[PDB]
Amino acid sequence: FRDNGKHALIIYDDLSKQAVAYRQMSLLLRRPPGREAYPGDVFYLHSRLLERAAKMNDAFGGGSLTALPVIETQAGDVSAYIPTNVISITDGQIFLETELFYKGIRPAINVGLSVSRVGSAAQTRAM
Amino acid sequence: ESTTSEQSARMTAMDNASKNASEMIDKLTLTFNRTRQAVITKELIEIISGAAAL
Amino acid sequence: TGRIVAVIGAVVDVQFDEGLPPILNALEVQGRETRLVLEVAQHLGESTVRTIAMDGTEGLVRGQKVLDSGAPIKIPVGPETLGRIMNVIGEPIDERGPIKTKQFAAIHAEAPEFMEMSVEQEILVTGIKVVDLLAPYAKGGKIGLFGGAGVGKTVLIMELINNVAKAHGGYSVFAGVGERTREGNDLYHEMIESGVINLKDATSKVALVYGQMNEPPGARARVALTGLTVAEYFRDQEGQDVLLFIDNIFRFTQAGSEVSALLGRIPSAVGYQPTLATDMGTMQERITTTKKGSITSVQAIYVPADDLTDPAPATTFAHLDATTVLSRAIAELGIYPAVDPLDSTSRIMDPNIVGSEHYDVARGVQKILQDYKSLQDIIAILGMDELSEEDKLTVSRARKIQRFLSQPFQVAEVFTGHLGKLVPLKETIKGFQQILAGEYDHLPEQAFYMVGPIEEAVAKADKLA
Amino acid sequence: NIVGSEHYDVARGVQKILQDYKSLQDIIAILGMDELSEEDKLTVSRARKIQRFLSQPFQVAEVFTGHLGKLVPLKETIKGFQQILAGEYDHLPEQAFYMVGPIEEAVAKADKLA
Amino acid sequence: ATGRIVAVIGAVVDVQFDEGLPPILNALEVQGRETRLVLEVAQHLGESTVRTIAMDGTEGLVRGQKVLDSGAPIKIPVGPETLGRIMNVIGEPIDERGPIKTKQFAAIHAEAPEFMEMSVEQEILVTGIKVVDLLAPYAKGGKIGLFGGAGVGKTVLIMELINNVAKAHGGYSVFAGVGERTREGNDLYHEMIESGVINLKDATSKVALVYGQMNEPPGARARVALTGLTVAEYFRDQEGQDVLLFIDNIFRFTQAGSEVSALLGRIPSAVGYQPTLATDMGTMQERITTTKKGSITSVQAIYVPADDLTDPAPATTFAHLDATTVLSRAIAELGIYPAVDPLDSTSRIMDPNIVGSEHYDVARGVQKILQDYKSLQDIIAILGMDELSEEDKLTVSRARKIQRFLSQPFQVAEVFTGHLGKLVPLKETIKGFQQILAGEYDHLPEQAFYMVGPIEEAVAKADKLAEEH
Numbered sequence A: 001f002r003d004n005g006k007h008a009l010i011i012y013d014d015l016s017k018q019a020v021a022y023r024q025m026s027l028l029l030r031r032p033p034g035r036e037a038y039p040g041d042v043f044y045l046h047s048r049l050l051e052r053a054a055k056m057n058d059a060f061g062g063g064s065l066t067a068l069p070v071i072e073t074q075a076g077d078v079s080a081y082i083p084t085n086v087i088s089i090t091d092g093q094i095f096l097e098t099e100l101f102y103k104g105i106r107p108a109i110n111v112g113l114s115v116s117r118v119g120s121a122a123q124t125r126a127m
Numbered sequence B: 001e002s003t004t005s006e007q008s009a010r011m012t013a014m015d016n017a018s019k020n021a022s023e024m025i026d027k028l029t030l031t032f033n034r035t036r037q038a039v040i041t042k043e044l045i046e047i048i049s050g051a052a053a054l
Numbered sequence C: 001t002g003r004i005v006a007v008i009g010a011v012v013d014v015q016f017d018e019g020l021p022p023i024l025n026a027l028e029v030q031g032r033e034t035r036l037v038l039e040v041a042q043h044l045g046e047s048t049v050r051t052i053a054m055d056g057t058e059g060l061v062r063g064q065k066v067l068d069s070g071a072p073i074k075i076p077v078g079p080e081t082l083g084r085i086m087n088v089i090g091e092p093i094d095e096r097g098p099i100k101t102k103q104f105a106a107i108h109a110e111a112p113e114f115m116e117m118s119v120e121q122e123i124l125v126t127g128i129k130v131v132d133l134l135a136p137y138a139k140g141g142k143i144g145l146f147g148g149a150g151v152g153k154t155v156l157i158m159e160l161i162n163n164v165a166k167a168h169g170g171y172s173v174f175a176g177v178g179e180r181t182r183e184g185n186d187l188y189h190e191m192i193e194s195g196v197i198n199l200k201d202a203t204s205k206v207a208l209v210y211g212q213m214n215e216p217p218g219a220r221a222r223v224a225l226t227g228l229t230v231a232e233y234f235r236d237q238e239g240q241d242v243l244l245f246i247d248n249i250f251r252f253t254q255a256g257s258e259v260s261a262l263l264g265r266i267p268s269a270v271g272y273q274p275t276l277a278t279d280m281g282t283m284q285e286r287i288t289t290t291k292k293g294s295i296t297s298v299q300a301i302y303v304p305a306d307d308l309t310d311p312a313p314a315t316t317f318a319h320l321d322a323t324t325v326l327s328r329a330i331a332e333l334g335i336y337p338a339v340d341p342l343d344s345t346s347r348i349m350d351p352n353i354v355g356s357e358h359y360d361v362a363r364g365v366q367k368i369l370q371d372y373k374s375l376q377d378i379i380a381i382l383g384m385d386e387l388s389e390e391d392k393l394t395v396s397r398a399r400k401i402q403r404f405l406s407q408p409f410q411v412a413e414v415f416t417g418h419l420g421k422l423v424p425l426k427e428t429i430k431g432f433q434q435i436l437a438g439e440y441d442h443l444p445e446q447a448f449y450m451v452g453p454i455e456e457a458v459a460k461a462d463k464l465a
Numbered sequence D: 001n002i003v004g005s006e007h008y009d010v011a012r013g014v015q016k017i018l019q020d021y022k023s024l025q026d027i028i029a030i031l032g033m034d035e036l037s038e039e040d041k042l043t044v045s046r047a048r049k050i051q052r053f054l055s056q057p058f059q060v061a062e063v064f065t066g067h068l069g070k071l072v073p074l075k076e077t078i079k080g081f082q083q084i085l086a087g088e089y090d091h092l093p094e095q096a097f098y099m100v101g102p103i104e105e106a107v108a109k110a111d112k113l114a
Numbered sequence E: 001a002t003g004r005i006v007a008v009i010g011a012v013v014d015v016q017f018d019e020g021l022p023p024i025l026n027a028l029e030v031q032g033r034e035t036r037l038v039l040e041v042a043q044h045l046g047e048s049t050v051r052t053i054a055m056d057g058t059e060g061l062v063r064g065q066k067v068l069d070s071g072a073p074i075k076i077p078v079g080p081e082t083l084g085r086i087m088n089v090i091g092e093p094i095d096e097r098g099p100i101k102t103k104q105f106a107a108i109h110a111e112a113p114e115f116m117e118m119s120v121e122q123e124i125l126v127t128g129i130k131v132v133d134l135l136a137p138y139a140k141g142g143k144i145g146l147f148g149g150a151g152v153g154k155t156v157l158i159m160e161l162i163n164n165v166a167k168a169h170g171g172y173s174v175f176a177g178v179g180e181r182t183r184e185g186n187d188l189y190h191e192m193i194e195s196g197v198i199n200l201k202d203a204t205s206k207v208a209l210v211y212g213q214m215n216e217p218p219g220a221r222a223r224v225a226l227t228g229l230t231v232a233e234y235f236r237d238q239e240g241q242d243v244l245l246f247i248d249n250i251f252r253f254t255q256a257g258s259e260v261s262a263l264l265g266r267i268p269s270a271v272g273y274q275p276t277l278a279t280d281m282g283t284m285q286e287r288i289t290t291t292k293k294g295s296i297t298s299v300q301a302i303y304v305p306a307d308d309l310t311d312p313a314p315a316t317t318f319a320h321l322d323a324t325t326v327l328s329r330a331i332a333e334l335g336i337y338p339a340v341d342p343l344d345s346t347s348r349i350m351d352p353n354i355v356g357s358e359h360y361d362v363a364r365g366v367q368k369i370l371q372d373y374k375s376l377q378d379i380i381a382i383l384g385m386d387e388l389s390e391e392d393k394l395t396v397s398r399a400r401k402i403q404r405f406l407s408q409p410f411q412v413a414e415v416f417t418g419h420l421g422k423l424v425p426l427k428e429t430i431k432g433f434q435q436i437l438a439g440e441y442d443h444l445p446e447q448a449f450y451m452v453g454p455i456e457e458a459v460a461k462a463d464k465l466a467e468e469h
């Protein structure tokens, strides 16, 4: 759809369980593990996939492709190996707190840590 | 009056010194548990790499 | 036939000539006293397979003879398996004669397809007032049972067997994954003295699968599959609403990471196997609600080193739909069953699943049980009478609610002398809808202790004085 | 020798008042603020403005917050850390020192929250 | 039977024979060197190929040097003539005073005595140190251990027991130094001539010395401790005297075998040691015993790596020691010297049927007031010292005087201190500590007990501080 002038949208759900599936095929080939027994090329796994989601110019049709991956953290750990390899790729974040979901605020969006860099200039002037 | 004013503020100021010491005691429990797993993981790789190169 | 070439520990290598068997088959060693079943796991090339044993390996000579079944491990299945005890290979281990039945089934079987799943959530009712109101049970889901010994856990097992066979008509299977012999003998005789198993006729309600603790590490991992084949017979052939008990799920994970290290594989994170997420996948996806019937599972969960983010209790947690926790601090308060009402959660607790009548009743119960938890500290430290008159009723009502959650069980009729009550769903919602509004507040506390519905509560206030 | 004897002396006073504040964070977090000395309620009350005076609104981040990008000269970031380490500005709150350029806009911000 | 060299990797030399294979644990002489290089056989590999470990360096070795065989393990010279001489691993003298001329040669590899050759009697050997004799008494014919990290005093405390014990002792004495600084083997040869223990002019010396230091190849720091307790086995067995034995250090026996291991073809165990760690340790430590033919007192210094007694090398020597003296850096940084931990040192004869009921209720009376002092420090950190009651302001002030009274000025540490060397007897150590506990010295400040001898000097030092106000 992107190369033929249409707009698409894709939700990967989730990229955490992909990287525990690439870990299994790597260690079953006897490859040297790294941090958290992961292989050395986990960054090649998620960068070569999320680089395709782009917007072509008007001479190429004018379509687009938006991505929205999902990462699951273990007890608020936003300083682990996998949730930092994907923060350093995507153009922003949306944080969901497990201790605002218990207090009755839903959707529990952490407004302090949620940022979107490039998408701020493209919104409605009414909004 | 002054021994009642003092003995009530000893009740409050010893209460916030146990909330702040229990708020601090959960944040070091997660870091203890990340680091406990990371040492079993690290010294497991050294045995495997020592046997594979042999 | 084949021949044994290598014997190293609990790993035997078998050399064939023509009929090379595929993976997940089952061989059988010829010349020995008891059955020794080998399970093929790898094709090593030049007609050689890599097998894991299921019993003792000593006495095996290099160059013996080994047959082939041509199929996986096939167990005796049927309706006449109710009330017997078997190991992982279907043999009976209680010296009551051979089990005789019509058909057999294989334990390594695929999941149901995508077009056979249920498209809607549905609540399973078990009769207990604390379970079916605050942490209800979905039909087909996986349940985690927190708590251990000395809390009253083995009664809650023996009573959920009895109530489903009364209100729903579905039997159960018990699978002991690496369990102690001393504690797997007392559960045999505790079920006899409560009626759910019976040595005289065909009114039994369970089938026991016991793979005990002193068995080789390949034989402690397949027990949760043998005890799931039997549970699939009563859904695929008869269409019942079966239950399934695994005790526990950590000894299924831990017994997996000792086969994957005897087979020469590089370990993952902290010591587990590389395949920690598919062995939990290719077991717990067979526990589902198809179009014929369902299978519901209650599993015991042991957390190692009090780490909730260890990979063994983190893989399991993505499969559960409801958790119930047995607190010992409610067992010293006198309440039975000792289920904590505040620290139990359910995923199907939702206004678009169980409706708005169940929701706003069970929402207010956990809110009022928090206010008594916050006001019990001012009363213990400062004193009683300083708090308002609007708060004295919340102290009085929350001691009515947390005693109305008690319920006498049918499995304990001989000992505590009371009558076992099985409460349907529409009585438990009607009851707590009136305690909150102050409608039955003038009656004393002991009218609510150990009754059935709300009707038997006011019939007990008359007998006082 | 290279940067001078006046640049080198103000830059070492800043690393001294920020290290002594770092050794009191284990006590302020437990026993609170009312357990310190009287001269150590001044190391805390001055290091919490030097920390906020090391903030600056960048020029490329105009599209983040909508604030103007500010640039300072080298001779004026020596004067800003002398009139704080001496005690000239002990009558202003900490949030008046937040996200400004040179030292003259700090007193042009504390008149707003009056 | 000659053989050739086919491979050299590091300190592990492979030697292929042709017709006669020597057994494991032998000696092979490399022909072609100007020095003597001995190879010790360690493994068999098939097709007449052994794998050896080298005692000296391996520079200048070429593939094809013809290697002889001895037919026996490393037989050092032994006898009465080796007293007052320094010798090598293979028995050569390095004191440059001539050849050791004796009649008996003895291999260093031999068995352990059986179960019906053990002795069972226990005694008490008095030293004169106040911390040692009170809370963890040593014993005649018993194995003693000196734990602790790096730079707390293991070499000085083992230099103190040669000062007190070795000159008042009747029989002989042996010092094996394994893997320590080559400087400190010269401050022993020059602190034992000026005290007359080593005599360079006649035949009245009482000390032998065996030295393999930390400049040697790692195949030679693991056969020196077997050479120390071979000379010390001659005196116990072929003669009948009472022998002592001092070993420093003994952690460098385990570490020097964890370096040749991975080239011999072994998978590593936990944190990096060899798989055969607790077997060759227990094969050496079963020859240092008291049999029915003699008695060997033995003091050993044991390095603990980076202050962790859960490391697998120090935490398996505990099964071979009767009296452990755990040193500590948390005491030494107070100024309390010798830094011996009282709540971590044990003995097998702390027993009211052996040391009497009066010594026993004094030892446990000291540890009970020190351990109860530990739990009181957790309150003073939040409350303060003055807000305590008057009843536990006294058990602190009694405990602080017991901490300071244990520190004693040593004799061989005069050049550090300038103070004089004290030696408190056993009957005075108990009577000093009864009176601080009962309260007979509550009128003195804490400084009157620091670095004193008996309790008599604790009040003489108290008045001399008073007059300078």
Ligand SMILES: Nc1ncnc2c1ncn2[C@@H]1O[C@H](COP(=O)(O)OP(=O)(O)O)[C@@H](O)[C@H]1O
Pocket (backbone or CB within 6 Å): E149, E150, E151, E152, E153, E154, E155, E156, E157, E336, E337, E338, E339, E410, E413, E416
């Ligand atoms: N009698 C003593 N009491 C306390 N400390 C001492 C004494 N003698 C030496 N030391 C200290 O012990 C340190 C190391 O001495 P030494 O025993 O030679 O080293 P190590 O114990 O590491 O082999 C020295 O820095 C010295 O200050």
Ligand SMILES: [Mg+2]
Pocket (backbone or CB within 6 Å): E154, E155, E180
């Ligand atoms: Mg030393």
